[PDB]
Amino acid sequence: RPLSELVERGWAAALEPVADQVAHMGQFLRAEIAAGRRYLPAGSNVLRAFTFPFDNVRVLIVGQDPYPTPGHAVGLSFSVAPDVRPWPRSLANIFDEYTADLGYPLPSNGDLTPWAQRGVLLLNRVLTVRPSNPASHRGKGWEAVTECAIRALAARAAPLVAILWGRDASTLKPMLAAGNCVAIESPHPSPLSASRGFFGSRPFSRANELLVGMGAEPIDWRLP
């Protein structure tokens, strides 16, 4: 199936340069299932970040790989389905910062769909994983796909704030080089690092400060 059938119109055009690569990933995934390996998220969710309009994106929040725990990954970085509990600890930490930064109550559940609807791109660098095997689809072909996506996003005339959590995300700074882009960076929300620079970083309000200063509307971050 061609890109225009899988993703939103603007993303299909942005991702044209990697259309063959995306087809190849579908072949890889089929071969995984034929070899008796599973993958997450569900097939229908793999490209989900690209189902929300390319032109509407104002904030990029980069992830690395999908959650490897069965039933967690949903195709948007960090998000979980509404019935998932307890929250993955990175997400719980994200939510702690959300409350402290913004003053909102704890969200009711871990579903970040409203952010995606509002132009927050929840993009993992690698879009699939074998269950219980963290980072197991590194090097399988997604990195070129998601690099194309980020470069296309950065090339738009429109404002963009990139939120870069952890060392691997910070290495994308070169590709956000353009005057229309601005990166904020901190240690990752995982418990390993969170108290050494993530908590108190105020990424949500600062992203809004930056967008307003670039002439854009702020993100309404409020979750149910």
Ligand X SMILES: O=c1[nH]cc([N+](=O)[O-])c(=O)[nH]1
List, by residue number, the catalytic residues: 65
List the interface residues with ligand X, window 133-192 (CB under 6 A): 190
Q: Which of 66, 107, 110, 119 binds ligand X (CB under 6 A)?
A: 66
Please work out, in degrees rounded to the nearest 5, the angle formed at the alpha carbon of residue 9 by the alpha carbons of 12 and 72: 75
> Which residues, listed in sequence order, are joined to residue 129 by a DSSP beta bridge?
40
- Verify binding: residue 54, Cl ion, rule CB under 5 A: no
* Binding partner of residue 37 among Cl ion, ligand X, none, CB cut-off 5 to 8 Å per kind: Cl ion
Q: Which of 11, 22, 52, 63 binds ligand X (CB under 6 A)?
A: 63
Going residue by residue from 123 to 162, which x/- string records binding to Cl ion, judged by CB under 5 A? -------x--------------------------------
Q: Are 63 and 115 in contact (CB under 8 A)?
A: no
| Contacting range for ligand X; rule: CB under 6 A; set: 46-54, 57-65, 107-115, 152-160 | 57-65
Q: Which of 64, 109, 133, 205 binds ligand X (CB under 6 A)?
A: 64
Q: Which of 37, 138, 167, 173 binds Cl ion (CB under 5 A)?
A: 37
Q: Following CA atoms 31, 37, 40, 46 in sequence, which dihedral angle do they give, to the nearest 10 degrees?
A: 0
> Which residues, listed in sequence order, are joined to residue 184 by a DSSP beta bridge?
163
Q: After which residues are there C–N gaps above 2.5 Å in the chain?
A: none
Please work out, in degrees rounded to the nearest 5, the angle formed at the alpha carbon of residue 193 by the alpha carbons of 190 and 197: 115
Please work out, in degrees rounded to the nearest 5, the angle formed at the alpha carbon of residue 5 by the alpha carbons of 33 and 43: 25
Q: Of 50 and 78, which has the nearer Cβ to ligand X? A: 78
The residues of the shown chain that bind ligand X, judged by CB under 6 A, are 63-67, 77-78, 90, 124, 190
